[model samples]
Every structure is written in C-alpha cells, then in structure tokens.
Target: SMSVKKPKRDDSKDLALCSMILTEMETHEDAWPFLLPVNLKLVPGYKKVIKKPMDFSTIREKLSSGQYPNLETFALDVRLVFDNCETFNEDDSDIGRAGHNMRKYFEKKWTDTFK
Candidate 1:
C-alpha cells in the first residue's frame, strides 16, 4: 500500500513575516496614524513609541497560537489592518500599496506552506 505524508510547516516564514510586519510598523511613518488606531482596537496600552511592535506581536501570537483555526481567518484580520488604512488613502497611493503588499505577503506565505 502507498501512503502520503504531510509536509512540515515552515514556521520560520511566519516568524520572518512577523518580524517584517513589526519593522514595517516601526518604519512606516505616515501609515502609523491609521495603524495605531487599528492596533489600539486589538491591544490597548500606553507603551508609546513601541506599542506598534507589541501590536504586531499580538497579531503574531494570534496567528501562531492556533487561535484562528486557519490561515484565511488570520489573513482576514491581517487584511483588515491594510483595509483600515484604505479609509484614509487612495488604493493606488504609497500607503495603499503598502497595505496591498502587506496582505500579499501573508497570502504568499500561506500558500507556500499549505499548498
């Protein structure tokens, strides 16, 4: 009889993404106004200047903890961050493009691991 084996998950990709997202949060200035509010909704705090990295960590925990059930659900929350930014910027603007790239990053990561 023949059997199939599942491929091991590349968790490093997710961690690398978490790191990238955190870096983006720290370096992307104009986009912070939008990101700050979105992050506050998830984790309220007074850790100014570095609160954003904590927020990304919260998101990373959510994705890694198996709390979301699947990548699509996790991706939904991830996409929402960028989607929220869309409320303040044109879809073709730099901020909008950044948001697009952010979501695209996760989508690619998910596909790379599961498909």
Candidate 2:
C-alpha cells in the first residue's frame, strides 16, 4: 500500500482557518464575496457563466436557459461552496479536498448548463 502523507484524521486547526475565511466573505460588502479573491486574468470566464441579477431577465429565463457562460464561473462556484461549508469532499475539486464533507447523504455532483 502507498504511504499516506495526510493526517490520519481531521485537522481542527485548518477547519478553524476555513471558518474565519468564510465569515470574512459573508460579512464583506461585495455582493459576490467569493469574487474578491479572483484575478483579472480569471474574471471574464466568471462573468460569462454567472447568471447574476443583470445577466437574465427572470429566474425562469436563467434556469431554463441552461447556459454556463464560462468555466471559471463553474470552478468559482465549486470553490465558493467549499468555502461556505465546514469541509470539502475527497474529490470535490480544489476545496473539496480540504476535509469538509458537504453531505453525508449525497455523492458530489457537478452539473453544467449551456445554451
């Protein structure tokens, strides 16, 4: 068997750090708090996929359209979800590996929409 480099169990310290990050994002003045960390090179993709208030006419128009404007938006959502949770899934992209298990009931599912 391969040697396991990770801690055998949970790391409370890391969890605490994540909690602080989340609280900061939550209290921040920005509407999309997660975007605060993204870089200029990374912005367009997020803008493309985001169905923000201005992106669509109504919730119905957006949901039924099934259009994801870009990949960075997708990746950002995945990261934001993890940032909000207590831990990440084992295979949940970047944040999922952090330790927080999003749901004890459901396997990680990522759905993409395009028009």
Candidate 3:
C-alpha cells in the first residue's frame, strides 16, 4: 500500500483554536472582568448566587491541560464566564458591560475562526 488513511481527528485543531481565542480574550479591554476568579471575601453574596464559578484563567488552564474533549465543550466554558458575569452583575454595571462587550468579541472571533 502506498499509504494508510489518516485518522480524522479535528480535536487537535479545535484545541489550537481554543488557545488562540484565549490569548485574544486576555488582551481585550473587556477581558479584565473575567481574567481571574472573583474575590470570595469581597462578595460572599456572589458565591451564594453563582454556585459554579468560571473565569478566563480557568478556561485557559483547561485548554492548557487538554481537559476539554471537543470544541463545543470549550465554547461552553467560554460562554460560562459570560453567563456567570450576567448573573451577578446588572446590565448597566461595570462588569456587566465588560461581559457584554467581550461576548461580542468572542462571538465574532469564534465565528470567524470556524467559518
């Protein structure tokens, strides 16, 4: 045989996309809101409402460690950060505005990458 068929593994490429997206998210001005975990000490009420906390760094760590199995899963985690922000911050609040702006950036970036 001249050659065996190559396995169709899109997982590798998906992870690469995740890596790039995360870097872009980190540099965006709106990114500061989700860059790190919230301070539990400052907002115990936050802990009460947002049971599960997700942040940009946590998502980066997951991608870095190859924890996500598919692109959809990775995407969900990214969205999770925004959802959490929405839950705790009002639409007109500083963090809420940041999350909304970052969501726009991320949605465009994701679409452009996959399109």
Candidate 4:
C-alpha cells in the first residue's frame, strides 16, 4: 500500500490568515469591494443567475470550504479572479488597487507564515 506523505508544517497559520481575511470581508465591504461584483455562475447552484452579479457570500463560502489543498493554490485562484475583472483598466483604478492589495496580502501572509 502506498502511504500518503503528510506535510511537516501545520495549517494553523493558513487558518489564521483565512480567518482574518474572511472576518475583514464580513465587516468591511470596502476592504474588497471588487469581489462584490463576482458572477454567480462561478458558484455552485447559481447557474440560472448567470449574467447577474452576486455578492461576496459565494466567495466566502468557497474560501472557507477547505476544498483547496493549500494556501498557495487558493491564492492563485483568487488572484486569477481579480485579474479577470474587466471593470477596471488602469492600475490606479479602485478595483485594480484592491486586487493588488489582496494579492500582496496573500503573498505577505504566506511568506510570513513560512518564514
């Protein structure tokens, strides 16, 4: 039988970071307002709501679902979602700025956790 190799590192750091991000989002809408325009189709059971913008609840659900194996992969998917935002063009745009901050937040938190 092939045994699965467990990571030496613990997931407490990831949980903390995810918790902080989620809590901040829960209280402060402006913290990541760009995510508010998410398409419902990205979430499960909302295919009929296509073309309609959904709130951040779906994002919250996805992030807290423990579906991703690690923080890096989760961050990558999140970054892509931000990158796909066509509503903003310039780097200084509100959505672009928020997205940049979020990316940096994940990088910084992940780095800090490992280091």
lDDT (Cα, 0-100) at 61 in candidate 1? 64
Candidate 4 lDDT: 0.57
CA-lDDT, candidates in order: 0.54, 0.35, 0.88, 0.57
Q: Against the true structure, candidate 3 has what lDDT?
A: 0.88
Q: Model 3: per-residue lDDT, tens digit, 15-58?
A: 78779988999999778889999998898698789888999889
Candidate number that wins on lDDT, 2 or 3:
3
lDDT of 1: 0.54
Give the number of the best model, judged by TM-score.
Answer: 3
lDDT of 4 by residue, 1-115 (tens): 2687765677767856766765654464445664455545565543543333333465566667876577766555555554554333357777667666665665675566555
Lowest-sum lDDT 10-residue window in model 2: 106-115
- Total colliding residue pairs, candidate 4: 0
Error of 4 at 113 (Å): 2.6
The model with the greater lDDT, 1 or 4, is 4
Clashing pairs in 2: 48-69, 49-69, 66-114, 87-100, 88-100
What lDDT tens digits, residue by residue, belong to model 1 across residues 1-115? 2487687665546545544654555465444444443444454342342322323445666656756654456556666666655554578777677766666665675566556
- Give the per-residue lDDT digits (tens) of candidate 2, residues 1-115: 4885765644334333333433443443432423334343655554444333121122123223544344334335435443443221235454443324432211133221111
